[PDB]
Design a protein around this ligand. Structure first.
Ligand SMILES: O=c1[nH]c2ccc(Cl)cc2c(N[C@@H]2CN3CCC2CC3)c1-c1nc2ccccc2[nH]1
Length: 273
């Protein structure tokens, strides 16, 4: 496949596959040939350009973009070793404080993409990988959405309930940076209390503190061990500000949410300080 050579499959979308490859280990994303019309293909090339311009340690470089000999659009990107952020933090038993530091780093990568006019649209643990580099947990944000609104509509869909914003779930036209903010909120909720956000009748989850308070003692013990804390300290630290921050990010109305990932970061730093 060009200067690049497929090793194994690592993902599928029904309208695209991702493979592990190599010249440097790469990801090679193939797009189904009938998924993008002339306009979608234009939009795809442009957004691929925008992505290629990002220079941030937490975002994969873009090596190549083209169309294969089967009519499929492709991109080659850096392959990032790592594990889903939530799973990684549990395995290495990070404190809330170390988790929030990683949240800042993830937020800084998403904020860098927003500033270059790029919105991810599918943030979730499997697209936010962590490894240890020079002793520190360092995140990698992968698999940005490209030309998602231009896809052949003749083709359980879209993103993941819980992470995807209500607007995206209602198939809305105006999906903006605030949708990534919602998804960060949902990820940060899980990092904080070890339980998924479940939107209740008013489209808002319980505060993390109340969520972990309701679960049985065995679930409670596991969550607290994975954060190197007692239940009572976990409950208090969440109540101290992480509840408010994650709930602001998870406001069902975009207008009531953080207006920017920059505003979310400021509140995370105020909690740490
Ligand atoms: O860089 C990667 N590293 C990984 C490491 C481990 C595993 Cl299991 C998957 C990926 C992985 N696939 C994810 C695993 N899962 C399915 C595909 C992808 C998102 C969630 C990517 C990746 N880099 C990409 C760059 C551009 C486009 C796609 C990309 N995928």
């Amino acid at each position: 496949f060009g200067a690049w050579a497929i090793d194994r499959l690592i993902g599928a979308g029904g309208m695209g596959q991702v493979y592990l490859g190599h010249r440097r280990e790469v990801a090679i994303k193939l797009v189904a040939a009938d998924a993008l019309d002339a306009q979608g293909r234009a939009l795809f090339e442009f957004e691929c350009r925008l992505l290629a311009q990002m220079v941030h340690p937490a975002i994969a470089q873009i090596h190549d973009v083209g169309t294969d000999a089967h009519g499929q659009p492709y991109l080659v990107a850096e392959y990032l070793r790592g594990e889903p952020i939530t799973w990684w933090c549990d395995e290495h038993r990070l404190s809330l404080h170390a988790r929030v530091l990683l949240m800042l780093r993830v937020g800084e990568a998403v904020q860098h993409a927003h500033q270059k006019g790029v919105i991810h649209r599918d943030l979730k643990p499997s697209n936010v990988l962590v490894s240890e580099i020079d002793g520190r947990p360092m995140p990698g944000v992968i698999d940005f959405g490209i030309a998602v609104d231009a896809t052949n509509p003749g083709m359980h869909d879209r993103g993941t309930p819980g992470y995807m914003s209500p607007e995206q779930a209602r198939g809305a036209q105006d999906v903006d940076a605030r949708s990534d903010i919602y998804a960060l909120g949902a990820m940060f909720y899980e990092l904080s209390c070890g339980l998924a956000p479940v939107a209740g009748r008013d489209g808002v989850p319980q505060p993390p503190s109340q969520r972990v308070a309701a679960v049985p003692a065995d679930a409670r013990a596991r969550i607290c061990a994975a954060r190197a804390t007692t239940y009572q300290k976990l409950h208090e630290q969440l109540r101290d500000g992480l509840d408010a921050i994650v709930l602001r990010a998870l406001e069902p109305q975009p207008g009531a949410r953080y207006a920017s990932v920059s505003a979310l970061l400021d509140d995370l730093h105020r909690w740490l300080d």
